[PDB]
Write a protein that binds this ligand. Sequence first.
Ligand SMILES: C[S@@+](CC[C@H](N)C(=O)[O-])C[C@H]1O[C@@H](n2cnc3c(N)ncnc32)[C@H](O)[C@@H]1O
Ligand SMILES: C[S@@+](CC[C@H](N)C(=O)[O-])C[C@H]1O[C@@H](n2cnc3c(N)ncnc32)[C@H](O)[C@@H]1O
Ligand SMILES: [K+]
Ligand SMILES: [K+]
Ligand SMILES: [Mg+2]
Ligand SMILES: [Mg+2]
Ligand SMILES: [Mg+2]
Ligand SMILES: [Mg+2]
Lengths: 380, 380
Amino acid sequence: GVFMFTSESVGEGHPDKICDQISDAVLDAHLKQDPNAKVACETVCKTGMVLLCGEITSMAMVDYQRVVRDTIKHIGYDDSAKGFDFKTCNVLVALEQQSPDIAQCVHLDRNEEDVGAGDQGLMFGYATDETEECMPLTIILAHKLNARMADLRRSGLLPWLRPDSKTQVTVQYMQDNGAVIPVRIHTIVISVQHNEDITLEEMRRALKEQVIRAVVPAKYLDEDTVYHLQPSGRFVIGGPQGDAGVTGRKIIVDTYGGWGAHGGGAFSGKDYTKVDRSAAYAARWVAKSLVKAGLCRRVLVQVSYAIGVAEPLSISIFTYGTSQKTERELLDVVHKNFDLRPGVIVRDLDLKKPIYQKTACYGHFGRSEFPWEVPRKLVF
Amino acid sequence: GVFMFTSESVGEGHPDKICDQISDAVLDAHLKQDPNAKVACETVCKTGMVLLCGEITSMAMVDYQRVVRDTIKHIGYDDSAKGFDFKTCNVLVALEQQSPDIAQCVHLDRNEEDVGAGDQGLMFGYATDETEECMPLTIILAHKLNARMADLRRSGLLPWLRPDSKTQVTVQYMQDNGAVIPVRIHTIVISVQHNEDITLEEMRRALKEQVIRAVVPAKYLDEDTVYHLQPSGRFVIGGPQGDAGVTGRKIIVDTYGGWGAHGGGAFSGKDYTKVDRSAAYAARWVAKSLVKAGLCRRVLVQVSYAIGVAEPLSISIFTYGTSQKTERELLDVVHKNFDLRPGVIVRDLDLKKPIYQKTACYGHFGRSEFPWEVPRKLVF
Ligand SMILES: C[S@@+](CC[C@H](N)C(=O)[O-])C[C@H]1O[C@@H](n2cnc3c(N)ncnc32)[C@H](O)[C@@H]1O
Ligand SMILES: C[S@@+](CC[C@H](N)C(=O)[O-])C[C@H]1O[C@@H](n2cnc3c(N)ncnc32)[C@H](O)[C@@H]1O
Ligand SMILES: [K+]
Ligand SMILES: [K+]
Ligand SMILES: [Mg+2]
Ligand SMILES: [Mg+2]
Ligand SMILES: [Mg+2]
Ligand SMILES: [Mg+2]
């Protein structure tokens, strides 16, 4: 019953991911001074331009030129030869206050515990026992390939590497009563921006031997694995010069790589009152807690909200046939162990801390440092 | 075994959907003069501003001020009292040629049939026999609620309505050997921008009696259905004035409302060489053809590509246990009946025709006018 499943990831210099990182750097900058800042920052990037736009109500005093240029510098775009330079790009800021019609409904006059959902929406959380981080192997490997290239770039071991990169991993799985077991790597794609000096054959050899073989467990690779390495043959123009970037255009990279499900909302640039983020984090937290408790091997959780209403409108659990308990029993477990109002989630998961720029590349899930990745011990 | 599932939709004046419609109006304008235009148009909107950015290589000569302002006019934003006016907003254009490093790999010198995938990526198609359009009931109803409000607005029957709107529908389902059967409407949310004259109680009564009851089959509604109608109590500030909008931030509204799966790519603003769009359309087409052929009741199809390579890297079929044939047999059926190279998809689905602005609101799927919604008769 073998099947293929593909996931992709992108590196820190991918233009959409640049925007996610800048949006969350702005959020972090506000939260460091005003833990209750209301932030909805969209970032757009294209040749020579970063535009910040959206809605912020905050007591913080933030140097947006500094925050943006510091983020671009850290990513590695510091010269016109690379197509983008934090020293000389245009930074445009079009930031306004949050609509008062929204504020009066969501949070004005309310105790923090009672804050309403910042919008309507649906969110999903997912977990799978196929890896120790409870994530799909496809997306984890895709992230790790990009992170390895960034390490080799920053260390100087491969000086021809530039920050813009994309990876894609196809894994063959067998199924086991609703659970999924990875069996082998079927195909890997890597494209990474490079300078003019290096030759194509050298690049492909380095991506195989210093990237792929350093990251992918050898038991999954064999002589029939397909490798598309620098498949375009030339990737000198890159970053925002090659492709426009926008916040919230990598939402499947950010989450489960196509597994589970997604409700549509972007994460980056948004404070905790935006349930698109906080409730997706909470749903991941619930799903991972269910799997770690031995209640299932695979689980999808849906929650939904209405603007201004603190309590979820609906909660659903799907275990793909991998639980002995029924989904109505699991729902009982969830109601007895979690309170999914946004004003409680913020306390359980410490969502006012300025840690969001860390989440904006290499995935929001699967990384044990974050509070939604620490399972709650369940009573049942 | 009853469960809840929620989907949402937005109306034509929602700021993210404004950008999708403008991006596809630009694509249509180019395709009317140059059927082979290469288009990757991102649109950003915020108070008083439309910014077009991205990459276009085309022989067409397009009046971007006219195209943008005509689109905003048709949506209905024609006065500062509504928060946005096509006559007086700022239109900024930052459009460059497609990267030559991409062009040499994707299409230069190649016959149309052999054009390579414009990017790497994964795409999904989904279909379900629960409605005659083979779509989830939740997302269809959510779309229809917004379309009904737009009709009542444009006819003058509810003159206090403005273009920005959001809907959300929670349905209770039972399952039937992997298939899903809608049973009742559990919750409906509607928020719509309004003028200052109308009272809250009048608005809520009109949304129930002239919108919901005109659109939702009465057999699904009962005395216990929950209604959150204008739940914020005041929604006068709206459109781009209330919330920044960006192309490709409604990808789950655009597709299956959280059902099936999504590979991450946005649709609007992209010509057929962008497999994010053409291969997702083709996968929907395959999935719907499988269901209409009686081969399954529910099906998810995954495909993936590498930049420059015409043939898919992987294809997967999941029937949720609703097919008598195995998924390997169904894969055989798909390989015998479809050719999923982008240069063949463009011919089968007529993807050079300038019909894309129609797809940019109310969903890309479930509408029989589009070629990917006309099932292919299968040999098997
Ligand atoms: C292929 S571009 C998307 C299409 C583009 N907007 C256009 O005009 O055709 C998307 C991503 O692919 C990567 N990319 C850019 N140039 C590339 C190249 N020459 N070869 C391989 N990948 C490239 C970059 O990560 C970029 O953000
Ligand atoms: C709630 S806003 C998103 C959050 C916003 N960016 C902020 O600063 O909090 C998202 C959408 O909700 C809708 N909306 C805007 N104002 C609203 C209001 N006062 N009541 C209900 N819905 C509203 C509009 O469709 C808007 O695009
Ligand atoms: K783009
Ligand atoms: K927004
Ligand atoms: Mg993109
Ligand atoms: Mg949202
Ligand atoms: Mg949005
Ligand atoms: Mg894409």
